[PDB]
Write a protein that binds this DNA or RNA. Structure first.
Ligand SMILES: Cc1cn([C@H]2C[C@H](O)[C@@H](COP(=O)(O)OP(=O)(O)OP(=O)(O)O)O2)c(=O)[nH]c1=O
Ligand SMILES: [Mg+2]
Length: 980
DNA sequence: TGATTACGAATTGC
DNA sequence: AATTAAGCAATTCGTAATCA
């Protein structure tokens, strides 16, 4: 009415607008960039793409004549063709035509003279008949290729070499201008991808938020009940790579003062507000729609209110660019309820939204959680202050209630300001973390749409990339399937190897750790762990060796059974390399380049002091590059992870077994080689290996120091020299080890890498060590203390244990001279524990709060009694009549904080748990002895495990557990003795 | 009534 | 007329059942 998309994009980019108008009039090739994808199942299959032109115009491009087909193996016999077509038509399925071709299977190894196998491809119209035919043929027991039953645009993208998340060049099109949209009709032989670097791109993203009200005190509004009401919606538009806005709108009910920044629309009813929201959405036509926590509170609220008022059809049809749809179809198809999104290996979240064609909905909270999966606080303030942005953009709810009760224009203006800022913060986060281009690159690399890049995990991306590389091979075309097959067994196969540490504190010999770089991918490259190079029979392996090939033998144990196999090597020939090695080789170069850039950035940063204003930006850029290379690393490891997954089409147990066995063999070989040279090895884990230097290297500096006055500065100089010679010797040792490995295997893929020097160091057990880190130059007056799994870095831990652990750890590394007093670890632990238990007046009501997750599906024992107790208390409170919202159950999958108090006359956790607010209201003094005896004793016993008096005789097998029990008992007796 | 054990759940390190 | 989801090794706590 006042300002639409076309006028804005013409005002912003006039020259590009004039250019695009000229090309449209002349009917010249254009550029297009997609965001959203939609397709039709019944009837003729046409693919819909919604996106942007160069200047900013919104366009929709429909592709017709996309072939629909799928492949089966069988044979070329005409009798087979007739039999298959008779079977297919016997179940009321209509097909178009049949074709024959030749392809190489993916499973098994064949010689050159019998490599190619026949295939029959069946064509179809509409996806429904194709899916039914695939299911029927697979159930009948026929091998099939292609085989993508869930989504079909992935197959189109991987077959036509047309990324759905990049620029596309339009040639020889049909054009029709309809209102604000530009209908484009194309044909697959048209198009093609844009190889060069495209322009800056111009897409529109709208961030929105809402504010609601309820008449009953202290309750979150619920759409199901009457009254309540949603009473403000504010929205703002932006480019895809910019923070400055283009337009902003506020829709409200109560009167408010006019503001120069935004436009205000005044309604007089709840229906009017939703209608105006839909109208403004239709006029702007966002390409992306965003809001914070909108998938759990906002969208269901609007949808439920609309159904209550019965205006869902109008809103959906005005927002959507697709054709008319009825209410039942909207409810069944375009309204998603309870969708599962994966965050970590043991976490998931539930999302629900409304999907209008022509716009993609994105939740900022999901992206932030996926970026930082180990964060206890998951609110806007926490994520906003983590990245370095300005926090404190929130408003109390009671103040909002009072302001709505008063019905004053200034208060409504203030709440409008706050919700506008809330809308802005989402775009701030999205631009700061650079989210959309990263997912864009992932989709380009994996041949997948952006919706999948936002709402899905990485296994299917791996499968799609493997199939895409297989079908485009230089020496043929390889057929791959997506449907899993074979019997599913329960169990685990052996893997990894950990070396028993020489426990204790080392303050005289520097220790250096060397590890393999990309161990498992390198093993795959070196030994050809590929499905097409696998031999299962012994006779075949014997014959292949007789002819003159080279094979790798694998054997291990699984479920009281021997698993045995062979693989074929490539002896440094490009023609003989497998498919997994090709993909991993292509992926490794990107990580190498990013690592070089990271090293250059670190070198540049090392020359800048902390006081310079530019230090924070350099730190941020360094962190982002590190995150990118870690993201590549996890994607690379997902290949091995999926190779052993029981639900994937690429399941092959011998591959994973051989990978793990070869890792163990290489680690043991390097261990023996280093031992037989005079060095001492203190630790090992999977690939990392920690070594110490001989005693003859430091003779000169030792003799020089022994003839001096023996002051502290002299010992500091001696330590500096020790570390320098340690690095100098370790470089040569690494070079010799790499040469030995290269001679052993015959290939340069496997290689060891230098990390750092740890001096002084302490090993408290398996997977538990700490020390001071030296990278390139010695430096001792630092506070960083490495730390790897010392139980003070976990999630559900109180501040008390962290403080005690830090106090103990930072005291054992103070660089004491040999001639001075060198105190053991036991006295440090005892002194810290005694100063903790005694003098308890140093702890406040902040060191005892601990957080835990509430998962109803999981059983647990302690939380499920606390929940029942709170439910009974709530029922008792509601009986007489009182407020009971203080004891509301947390949302499933979320974490809650709690404290432990004293219960009079029990003796169980869960009968003493209380909420933080309830405890603060009613004092409820804390039991400190419970915290001590249940949490500090284990850590303190782990520190002093190494001592001799706790050791078992030679008969006991598991010495570590026995020693831990004895240390815990000894410390328990000590703590009972010091203060009853 | 005490000591000991077994199994699920939680969380880190590769 | 409906559907996701990489692997294993190692330690620590918490409650109920069985054993002297
Ligand atoms: C981190 C990680 C490792 N692993 C396994 C496979 C790896 O080969 C093995 C050891 O990996 P690391 O030695 O931790 O790392 P890397 O060798 O892959 O790379 P870099 O040295 O540059 O850090 O751990 C997984 O299976 N999944 C994972 O998520
Ligand atoms: Mg490594």
């Amino acid at each position: 009415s006042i300002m639409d998309r076309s006028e804005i994009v013409a005002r912003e980019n006039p020259v590009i607008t004039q250019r695009v108008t000229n090309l449209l009039q002349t009917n010249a090739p254009l550029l297009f960039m997609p965001i959203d994808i939609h397709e039709v199942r019944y009837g003729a299959y046409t693919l819909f793409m919604y996106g942007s032109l160069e200047n900013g115009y919104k366009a929709e491009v429909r592709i017709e004549n996309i072939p629909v087909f799928f492949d089966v193996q069988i044979e070329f016999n005409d009798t087979n063709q007739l039999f298959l077509k008779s079977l297919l038509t016997a179940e009321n399925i209509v097909y178009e035509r049949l074709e024959t071709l030749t392809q190489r299977p993916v499973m098994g190894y064949r010689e050159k003279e019998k490599e190619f196998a026949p295939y029959i491809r069946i064509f179809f119209k509409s996806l429904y008949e194709r899916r039914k035919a695939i299911t029927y043929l697979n159930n009948m027991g026929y091998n099939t290729a292609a085989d993508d039953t869930t989504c079909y645009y992935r197959m189109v993208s991987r077959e036509l070499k047309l990324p759905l998340t990049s620029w596309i060049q339009l040639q020889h099109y049909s054009y029709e201008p309809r209102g604000l949209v530009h209908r484009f009709s194309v044909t697959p032989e048209d198009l093609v991808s844009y190889q060069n670097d495209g322009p800056t791109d111009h897409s529109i993203v709208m961030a929105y938020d809402i504010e609601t009200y309820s008449p009953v005190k202290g309750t979150v509004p619920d759409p199901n009940q009457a009254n309540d009401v949603v009473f403000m919606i504010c929205m703002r538009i932006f480019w895809i790579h910019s923070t400055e806005p283009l337009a902003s709108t506020c829709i409200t009910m109560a009167p408010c003062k006019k503001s120069s920044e935004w436009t205000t629309i005044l309604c007089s009813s709840e229906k009017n507000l939703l209608l105006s929201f839909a109208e403004q959405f239709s006029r702007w036509a966002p390409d992306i729609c965003t809001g914070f926590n909108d998938s759990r509170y906002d969208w269901p609220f609007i949808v439920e209110k609309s159904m209550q008022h019965g205006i869902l059809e109008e809103i959906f049809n005005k927002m959507s660019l697709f054709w008319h749809q009825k209410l039942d179809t909207i409810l069944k198809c375009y309204y998603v309820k309870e969708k599962r999104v994966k965050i970590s290996a043991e976490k998931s979240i539930i999302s629900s939204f409304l999907h209008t064609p022509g716009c993609l909905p994105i939740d900022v909270r999901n992206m932030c959680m996926q970026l930082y999966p180990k964060a206890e606080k998951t609110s806007l303030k926490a994520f906003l202050e983590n990245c370095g942005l300005d926090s404190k953009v929130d408003l109390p709810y009671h103040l909002m209630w009072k302001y709505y009760e008063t019905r004053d224009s200034e208060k409504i203006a203030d709440v409008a300001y706050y919700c506008i800022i809330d809308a802005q913060r989402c775009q701030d986060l999205l631009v700061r973390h650079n989210v959309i281009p990263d997912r864009r690159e992932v989709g380009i690399l994996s041949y997948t749409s952006l919706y999948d890049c936002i709402y899905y995990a990485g296994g299917h991306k791996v499968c799609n990339m493997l199939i895409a590389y297989a079908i485009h091979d230089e020496y043929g075309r390889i057929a791959c399937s997506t449907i899993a097959r074979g019997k599913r067994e329960h169990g685990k196969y052996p893997g990894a190897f950990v070396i028993d540490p020489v426990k204790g504190l080392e303050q005289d010999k520097p220790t250096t750790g060397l590890d393999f770089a990309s161990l498992y991918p390198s093993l795959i490259m070196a030994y050809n762990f590929s499905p097409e190079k696998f031999v299962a029979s012994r006779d075949e392996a014997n014959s292949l060796m007789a002819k003159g090939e080279s094979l790798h033998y694998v054997s291990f144990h699984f479920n009281n059974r021997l698993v045995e196999g062979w693989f074929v090597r490539h002896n440094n020939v490009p023609d003989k390399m497998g498919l997994y090695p090709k993909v991993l080789i292509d992926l490794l170069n990107k990580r190498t380049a990013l690592k070089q850039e990271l090293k250059k950035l670190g070198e540049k940063k090392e020359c800048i002091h902390e006081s310079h204003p530019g230090f924070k930006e350099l730190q941020f850029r360094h962190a982002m590059v590190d995150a990118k290379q870690k993201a590549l690393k996890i994607f690379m490891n997902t290949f091995y992870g999926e190779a052993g997954n029981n639900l994937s089409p690429f399941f092959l147990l011998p591959l994973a077994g051989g990978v793990t066995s070869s890792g163990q063999y290489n680690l043991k070989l390097v261990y023996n080689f280093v031992i037989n040279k005079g060095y001492g090895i203190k630790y090992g884990d999977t690939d990392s290996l920690y070594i110490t230097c001989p005693d003859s290297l430091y003779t000169e500096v030792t003799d020089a120091y022994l003839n001096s006055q023996k002051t502290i500065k002299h010992y500091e100089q001696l330590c500096h020299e020790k570390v320098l010679l340690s690095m100098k010797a370790m470089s040569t040792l690494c070079a010799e080890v790499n040469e030995y490995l290269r001679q052993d295997n015959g290939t340069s893929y496997l290689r060891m890498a230098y990390e750092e020097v740890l001096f002084p160091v302490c090993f408290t057990g398996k997977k538990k060590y700490y020390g001071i880190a030296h990278v390139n130059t010695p430096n001792f007056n630092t506070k960083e203390l490495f730390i790897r799994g010392i139980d003070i870095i976990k999630q559900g831990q109180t501040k008390l244990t962290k403080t005690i652990g830090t106090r103990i750890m930072e005291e054992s590394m103070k660089l004491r001279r040999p001639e001075d007093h060198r105190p053991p670890l036991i006295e440090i632990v005892k002194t810290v524990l005694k100063d903790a238990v005694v003098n308890m007046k140093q702890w406040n009501f902040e060191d005892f709060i601990q957080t835990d997750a509430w998962r109803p599906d999981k059983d647990n024992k302690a939380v499920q009694i606390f929940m029942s107790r709170m439910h009974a208390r709530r029922e008792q409170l509601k009986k007489h009549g009182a407020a009971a919202s203080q004891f509301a159950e947390p949302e499933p999958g979320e974490r809650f904080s709690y404290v432990i108090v004293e219960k009079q006359v029990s003796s169980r956790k869960g009968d003493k748990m209380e909420y933080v607010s309830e405890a603060k209201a009613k004092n409820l003094p804390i039991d400190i002895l419970f915290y001590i005896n249940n949490y500090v004793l284990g850590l303190c016993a782990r520190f002093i495990n190494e001592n001799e008096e706790f050791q078992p005789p030679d008969n006991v097998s598991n010495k570590d557990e026995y020693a831990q029990r004895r240390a815990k008992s000894y410390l328990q007796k000590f703590v009972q003795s010091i203060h009853p």
